[PDB]
């Protein structure tokens, strides 16, 4: 199983340590071999501008859930918590797009 | 709340697994923390509405567990597994992954 | 091929004769045997309230297209024109739902 | 405008049909009435972005025709057919019907 595309995301915790504020950005995002990789902060169109990996999240032992209204005002926000205690929010306004990532990441956890 | 046609089968009765799957498509309603699967929508062609007005399966979502099913649980794609607090279990499916993800979101909110 | 569910719709022309105003309503809707049937004007939840057929549209010879911004202010509006000159608008705010109907009706025309 | 990964194959070159399908998944960009399919996204695993920066197929949408493909045109599901004014033809696909419908909407607007 693999997935690739541009998604909106922000880290929210670094191994259990909460970030002070949100840093929403669009980035190239890749799910491959049970690892989700978010590329660096940036619509984002040309592959020559997609930059390089910033964050990697192993899906083994992770949890994925819909974020509560208190966590974000954005539409279709998912919260991904890795086993090491890092946390990320992922979202896209398009149901079509957020759905494909929800499926891939949820199924990938397994 | 939400309503739509979904594929579903019961897979366990109060913790006791069923021998085989019994899939049907039915109207489905999520309202007030309760998920209701109506009688099969098919005549064998579509039934008229009055013919599927009786609930077949009602699942109270308080204490329920929702997940994406393991891929080997069914030959079908886009399967959710729902287990109620009494141990009954259901699979929920649609060929549209977007339909299923949006239902997952709604059911997850109903559980919470 | 068949499809069934609740959709928002309004007739806009009766065999080439424009309606004075829009009459948007949710209704039970069924696609079966190359015919799309909209039930009577009404969310709509209990099958005991779905009423009876109101409009039938044969898909043979029909056209389905995305409605221009001038035709409706709603989200995801499709325009269905039957060969006899009747016209309908169909929409749903959920991409997941409008997409399933778009596919079914477009493929049904063929 | 829109961008995403899609499956596509060319099926005719300037009106002349190709013998077989040549499907790949690639980054795809719709911008200003032009649909660009980049080089294949796969290495054999995913290529890094710099490796698929070159366009493979560019389709100018002025005078193009878009449709849902006949079901027998391909063994795949959710296939669109796009024919450019020079007679070249492409199929576009994704397992998600919602992805494909939203792309149909965008391409249709680009044509108009």
Pinpoint the alpha helices (H) of A1-110.
95-109
Task: Calculate how close chain B gets to A78, using CA atoms only, in Å.
Answer: 10
D101 touches chain A (CB under 8 A): yes
Closest C-chain CA to A93: C95
Q: Domain limits of chain D?
A: 1-112
Supply D86's token pair.
């020079």
Angle at C50 between CA C49 and CA C55, to 5 degrees: 145
Verify whether the Cβ–Cβ distance B99 to C95 is below 8 Å. no
Residue B13 backbone dihedrals phi, psi, to 5 degrees: -110, 110
Which of D90, D69, D64, D96 is closest to D80 using CA atoms? D69
Rg (CA), chain B: 13
Is-contact B98 C96, C-beta < 8 A? yes
Is-contact B54 B37, C-beta < 8 A? no
Is-contact C33 C103, C-beta < 8 A? no
Is-contact D40 D24, C-beta < 8 A? yes
For D:67-96, CB contacts with B below 8 A are: 95-96
Question: Which chains sit next to C, with 3 or more Cβ pairs under 8 A?
Answer: A, B, D
Sign of CA dihedral C63, C67, C71, C74: positive
Question: Quick count: other Cβ atoms within 10 Å of Cβ D109?
Answer: 15
Supply A32's token pair.
């491959």
Verify whether the Cβ–Cβ distance C32 to B49 is below 8 Å. no
Q: Which residues of D touch C95 (CB under 8 A)?
A: 98, 101-102
Helix (H, G, I), strand (E, B) or coil at D49: helix
Task: Calculate how close chain A gets to D79, using CA atoms only, in Å.
Answer: 16
CA B58 to chain centre: 9
| CA atoms of C82 and C66, how far apart (whole Å) | 15
Sign of CA dihedral A69, A75, A76, A77: negative
Supply C5's token pair.
């569910």
First to last CA, chain B: 13
Q: E-assigned strands of chain A?
A: 2-14, 17-18, 25-32, 35-39, 53-58, 63-66, 78-81, 87-91
| CA atoms of C67 and C76, how far apart (whole Å) | 8
Question: Quick count: other Cβ atoms within 10 Å of Cβ A103?
Answer: 22
Q: Please give the biggest Cα pair distance in chain B.
A: 37
Question: Which chains sit next to D, with 3 or more Cβ pairs under 8 A?
Answer: A, B, C
This structure's resolution (Å) is 1.4
Question: Quick count: other Cβ atoms within 10 Å of Cβ C29?
Answer: 21
Assigned CATH topology for domain B1-112? PH-domain like (2.30.29)
> Which run of H or of E encompasses C107?
helix C95-109
D100 touches chain C (CB under 8 A): yes
B104 touches chain A (CB under 8 A): yes
| CA atoms of C54 and C70, how far apart (whole Å) | 26
Instruction: Indicate the DSSP class of residue C47.
Output: G
Task: Calculate how close chain B gets to A71, using CA atoms only, in Å.
Answer: 15
| CA atoms of A30 and A6, how far apart (whole Å) | 9
Supply C56's token pair.
């039938």
Is-contact D104 D51, C-beta < 8 A? no
Verify whether the Cβ–Cβ distance D96 to B96 is below 8 Å. yes
Is-contact B3 B29, C-beta < 8 A? yes
Instruction: Indicate the DSSP class of residue B32.
Output: T
Helix (H, G, I), strand (E, B) or coil at C96: helix
Which of C65, C61, C54 is closest to C30 using CA atoms? C54
Question: For residue B90, what are the β-bridge partners?
Answer: B10, B82
| CA atoms of B99 and D30, how far apart (whole Å) | 25
CA D15 to chain centre: 17
Cα dihedral: D82, D83, D88, D91 (round 10): 20
CB-count exposure of residue A17 (10 Å: 0-12, 13-18, 19+) = exposed
> Which run of H or of E encompasses D108?
helix D97-111
Task: Calculate how close chain D gets to A23, using CA atoms only, in Å.
Answer: 22
**In angstroms, what CA-CA distances link B33 with B52, B68, B74, D74?**
21, 19, 26, 43
Of A65, A76, A103, the CB nearest to B97: A103
> What would the 3-class secondary structure string for B76-112 be?
CCCEEEEECCCCCEEEEECCCHHHHHHHHHHHHHHHC
Question: For residue C85, what are the β-bridge partners?
Answer: none
Assigned CATH topology for domain A1-110? PH-domain like (2.30.29)
Rg (CA), chain D: 13
Helix (H, G, I), strand (E, B) or coil at A100: helix
Which of A46, A30, A96 is closest to D39 using CA atoms? A46
Sign of CA dihedral C74, C77, C81, C86: negative
Residue C71 backbone dihedrals phi, psi, to 5 degrees: -85, -35
Sign of CA dihedral A68, A74, A77, A81: negative
User: Which positions ≥6 away from C44 have C-beta within 8 Å?
Assistant: B3, C6, C26, C27, C28, C50
Q: E-assigned strands of C22-77?
A: 25-32, 35-39, 53-58, 63-66
Which of D36, D43, D40 is closest to D3 using CA atoms? D36
Instruction: Indicate the DSSP class of residue B70.
Output: P
Rg (CA), chain A: 13
Supply B51's token pair.
């013919």
For D:53-72, CB contacts with C below 8 A are: 67-68, 70-71
Task: Calculate how close chain A gets to C99, using CA atoms only, in Å.
Answer: 9
Verify whether the Cβ–Cβ distance A4 to D53 is below 8 Å. no
């Amino acid at each position: 199983l693999d997935k690739a595309g541009v998604l909106h995301r922000t880290k929210t915790a670094d191994k259990g340590k909460r970030l002070r504020k949100k840093h929403w950005s669009a980035s190239w995002t890749v799910l491959e071999g049970g690892v989700l990789t978010f590329f660096k902060d940036s619509g984002l169109r040309q592959p020559s501008k997609f930059s390089t990996p910033e964050y990697t999240v192993e899906l083994r032992g992770a949890t994925l859930s819909w974020a509560p209204k208190d966590k974000s005002s954005r539409k279709n926000v998912l919260e991904l918590r890795s086993r090491d205690g890092s946390e990320y929010l992922i979202q896209h306004d398009s149901e079509a797009i957020i759905s494909t990532w929800h499926k891939a990441i949820a199924q990938g956890i397994q």
